[PDB]
Amino acid sequence: ATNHNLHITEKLEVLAKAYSVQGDKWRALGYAKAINALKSFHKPVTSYQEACSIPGIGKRMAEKIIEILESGHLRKLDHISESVPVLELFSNIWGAGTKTAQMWYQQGFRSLEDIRSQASLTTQQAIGLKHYSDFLERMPREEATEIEQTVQKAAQAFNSGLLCVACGSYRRGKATCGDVDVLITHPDGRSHRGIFSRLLDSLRQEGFLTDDLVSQEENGQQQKYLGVCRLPGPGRRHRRLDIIVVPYSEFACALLYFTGSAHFNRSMRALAKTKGMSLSEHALSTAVVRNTHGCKVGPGRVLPTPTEKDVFRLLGLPYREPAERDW
DNA sequence: CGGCGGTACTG
DNA sequence: CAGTAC
DNA sequence: GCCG
Ligand code: NA
Ligand code: NA
């Protein structure tokens, strides 16, 4: 598609990012939805009524849209706190969100050097600070492929039958990727067990993993690593790498979840809800059991889904290719 | 108005 | 319980 | 912020 409302969405994005770094996440979310709708719209917007006809745009958003349309400017931008660019700087540090960014700003910090010299830093934030510039850039998908191959080769050394796939924006076919998520399972349903620890050990020993952000997260039968890798060779940057090992029966739903996008996942959860189902990285399930007072007592029952297509089918949806899952 | 996932780790 | 990122 |  093509954006016919550029000067409008450019302005809205400024406002959206301001709300985000100030921690108004719900308001930012609503802006994101409206901003999407505007770009993928058959025409430039020429009236308030037309703006409101668009799902995701109500009175308040339409008002701003038409103000921009007519005057070329959005006044609310002129009343945006001067702190916003610094809050964004601080929250670009992996492990620091808006609360930490506020705290540092109130302490009078203004720069990364300020943070590096005088800020108290969590173990994760120190790594995120140390690799600030590397983590901010998106890598070419070619480099993501090499990263996936590195993980896959070290995994298949333990069991050649392991199935390994890079998810996220890479699987959605983007030219560049902010990170790499490598999802690992085994078709025999059992031989994924034991792999996670040995795999991280092997990647450690050969120098590929340079820092761990979360060395192990256990979520049901899924194991997740969040860390930092760097391919061999000179001129290589540090990159964010996640590794998730899952049982074969959850592979389709894990695959879907880690392929995303985040916005696509949110809309699929909403759709499942309408059908009295829930959708997680583990399973498509019937909705949980709620008692007399409306509180969840027990989990629902899993609807088995061997493949991503099975998930879409049970939801009464046409299959969507990963490249079509940005929204 | 409340929901817009729920979750693990960590403190 | 709250902060963060998935 | 928007939606029901
Ligand atoms: Na609307
Ligand atoms: Na951050």
User: For residue A256, what is the domain's CATH number?
Assistant: 3.30.460.10
Nucleic acid strand B: bases within 7 A of protein CB: 3-5, 7-11
Neighbours of A11 (CB within 10 A): 19
A181 is in an annotated binding site: yes
Residues A105, A208: one domain?
Answer: no
Per the structure, the count of domains in chain A is: 4
Residue at the smallest CA–C1' distance to nucleotide D3: A56
Provide the residue type at A192 as one letter.
H
For A228, half-sphere exposure in the C-beta direction (CA atoms, 13 angstrom radius) is 19
Residues A163, A199: one domain?
Answer: yes
CA A247 from chain centre, in angstroms, equals 22
Residues A267, A244: one domain?
Answer: no
Residues A280, A316: one domain?
Answer: yes
CATH number assigned to the domain comprising residue A127: 1.10.150.20
A153 is catalytic: no
CA–C1' nearest nucleotide, residue A258: C6
Please give the helix or strand (H or E) that residue A68 lies within, else none.
helix A59-71
Which two structure tokens, joined as six digits, stand for A258? Answer: 């880690």
Catalytic residue, from A64, A273, A275, A309: name it. Answer: A64
CATH number assigned to the domain comprising residue A296: 3.30.210.10
Domain boundary among A137, A171, A202: A137
How was this structure determined? It was done by X-ray
Q: CA of A75 vs C1' of B4, distance in Å?
A: 28
Q: CA of A61 vs C1' of D4, distance in Å?
A: 18
Please give the Cα distance from A50 to A234 (Å, whole number).
55
A183: Cβ–Cβ under 8 A, 6 or more apart, which residues? Answer: A164, A165, A166, A167, A244, A246, A251, A254, A255, A258
Residues A152, A66: one domain?
Answer: no
Residues A112, A126: one domain?
Answer: yes
Beta bridge partners of A226: A214, A242
Burial letters A86-102, b for 16+ CB under 10 A, else e: bbbbbbbbbbbebebbb
Packing angle between helix A6-21 and helix A59-71, nearest 10 degrees?
130
Q: Which long-range contacts (CB under 8 A, 24 or more apart) does A99-107 make?
A: A99/A23, A100/A125, A101/A21, A102/A23
Domain that holds residue A25: 1-83
Cα A298 to averaged position of ligand 2 atoms, centre (Å): 35
A94: Cβ–Cβ under 8 A, 6 or more apart, which residues? Answer: A124, A125, A127, A128, A131, A135, A213, A240
> How far is CA A139 from each of CA A43, A108, A155, rounded to the nearest angstrom?
33, 33, 23
Q: CA of A319 vs C1' of D2, distance in Å?
A: 27
CATH number assigned to the domain comprising residue A5: 1.10.150.110
